[PDB]
Structure formats: C-alpha cells, structure tokens
Amino acid sequence: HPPEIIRKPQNQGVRVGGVASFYCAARGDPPPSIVWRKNGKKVSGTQSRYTVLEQPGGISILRIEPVRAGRDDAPYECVAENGVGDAVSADATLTIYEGDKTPAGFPVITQGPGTRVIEVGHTVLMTCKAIGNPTPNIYWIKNQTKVDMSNPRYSLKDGFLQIENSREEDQGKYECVAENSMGTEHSKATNLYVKV
Helix, strand or coil: CCCEEEECCCCEEEECCCCEEEEEEEECCCCCEEEEEECCEECCCCCCCEEEEEECCCEEEEEECCCCCCCCCCEEEEEEECCCCCEEEEEEEEEEECCCCCCCCCCEEEECCCCEEEECCCCEEECCEEECCCCCEEEEEECCEECCCCCCCEEEECCEEEECCCCHHHCEEEEEEEEECCEEEECCCEEEEEEC
16 A cells, blocks of 8 residues: 655754754555655765654654755655555755844744753753744754653643653753744753763
C-alpha cells in the first residue's frame, strides 16, 4: 500500500542566524522511509549545520543552524517512499529574514531559559517570555528534540517549563521555541545542571 504523510512540514520564516526546523511524519505498509530534499536534491545530515533526526512514530525532523541567508532559504520537500514503487511528498519553504525585515508580529523572545543549577528533588521553572501577533505558541526542546510533556513531572505554566522533583536525568541543553503564523524563533540553548 502507498505511504501517507500524517504530518506535513510547514513553511518556516526564521531570522538570519537562527534555527529552522521542519517536521514530517509518515506511515504505511510496508513502512515508509522519509528523506528531505532541498531545491530537489537530497539533504544529508552529514553536511554541517544540517541535522536529520528520526523518532518512533515515523517522524523525521530536519534542523538547520545557524541559518544563512543566500544558502538555506529554499523550497524543501519531505518525501516518503515505501521502497516497493510508491512515494508521496509535501513541500515547505524556508524564508529567511535579515535585519528588521521580519513580518510585523513576528515572535520575539524577550527572556529565554538561562543557565540554571537545580538540586535533586527540587522544582525548577524555566522562563520563556515571548511576544507576538498572533500570541505565540511556546514549546520546549531538550538536546534538539521536543521535551516529552507526557512526563508527569513536566508541565507548562504560561509558557514556562516546570520540572518538579528534578532528577539527574533531567539535565541537558534546553531551548524554547516561540511560533505563530508570522514566523518561528528559537531561544538560545542553555544548560540545566542537576546537583546531586
């Protein structure tokens, strides 16, 4: 059976020097593989600044950082192939904004997470203060992948990430992402250290 894309990548508008990422998810029988194309050519995670992350659920993420004007702004494609003769694809473009040429209402992170040390068993609240029009959605990434918010110790409070009863496992490099219809901004990433 032909594969189907259950989550299409979305156009991204990002500031020069920032982080861009596209998400794609596909499934099928036989199970499909996902590849990313840029200007019609395969993208390889072997090249610097480009990273391809796979996760269970048929998920592939293309992450680019830092983005360079003239180099990374292009139409991309997610292509899901089953290896037996069928493929499907979905397009998404990366638009890069230099200087103050951002769309009006583009998300601004006025305070991102800062370097923090927390004692085991203590609660930490990581700040992400962002503004935009529309009001931005906020989500959290640790070590390049979305934080699993189904963890009962993790929750969002007005966009801030709360980790209760911290464990050594929680340590890592966190960033928040502020997104709306006008663009996407990643905060600088910072270390959470858990002191035992």
